[PDB]
Structures are given as structure tokens and as C-alpha cells.
């Protein structure tokens, strides 16, 4: 368990935690099928030495992982845990996606996180 998300991160520049309305939020991946469109975003916080010499938090990043993969590969869909939010497209199956898995940066670039037309990013969220 030393995983890389298949996608680039969503950066939280605002004060609200990430959330999506039911049916929205699964990044587009042409190498996946309708049954696979389900997973979670996990908040990844980073700290840095600021200009004044004090440690400070950077804007949190949220990375998507297919259900049954990634840092919370053992969590069932819908499990309540701080820093974890769930997303699923209509018709997705609630089964682990080991056949998609996570990405190896040695042989695959991250896929730029894109969401379909009818879905906008929540307040304070940016796909950098």
C-alpha cells in the first residue's frame, strides 16, 4: 500500500470539504466501463516551511481512487471517515475495482481529472 491515484488532484482553495451530489464526481476514464464508475476522494494534506519560518498547511488536495483500491482499499462504499468522500455514477456496481487498481508512475502518467458537462466543481475546488 504505496499508491498513486490514476488522476490529477482537485485542490481545495476554499474552506468547505469536497462533496458531490449523488451521481456526480467520478472522473472520466475512457479505459474503464460503466460498472467501474465508483470510488472515493481522499484528502491529502501537505505542510511546508513558510516564509516567516513557521510550518503552515498548504491547500488540501483530494485524490480519487476506485472503490476497493488505494489508501482505503478496505473501506466499504459509504463508510464515514474524515477526509474520505464517496462518489458513484448511476449504474455502477458496489464491488472492488482490482482490475483497474492504482497507477504506477513509472509507466503511466496521471490522467487529467475531468468531469462531464452537467457537473461543475464545488465551491473553492480547482483541477490544477
Numbering used by the authors: 47 to 174
Published text:
All crystal structures of nat_mutants with WT-like RNA-binding (nat_mutants P67S, A119S, E136D and P151S) superimpose well with the NTD WT with RMSD values between 0.592 and 1.776 Å. Mutated residues in the above-named nat_mutants lie peripheral to the structural core, which further supports both the converging structures and the unaltered apparent RNA-binding affinities. High-resolution crystal structures supported by solution NMR data reveal that all six nat_mutants are overall conservative regarding fold and functionality.
One central protein involved in the formation of regulatory ribonucleoprotein complexes (RNP) is the coronaviral structural protein nucleocapsid (N). N plays a major role in RNA genome replication, translation, and packaging and has further been found to interfere with host-integrated stress responses and stress granule formation. The N-NTD possesses a peculiar, hand-like three-dimensional fold, with a β-sheet palm and several flexible loops, arranged as fingers around the central β-sheet. The latter, together with the extraordinarily long basic β-hairpin finger, constitutes the positively charged primary RNA-binding surface.
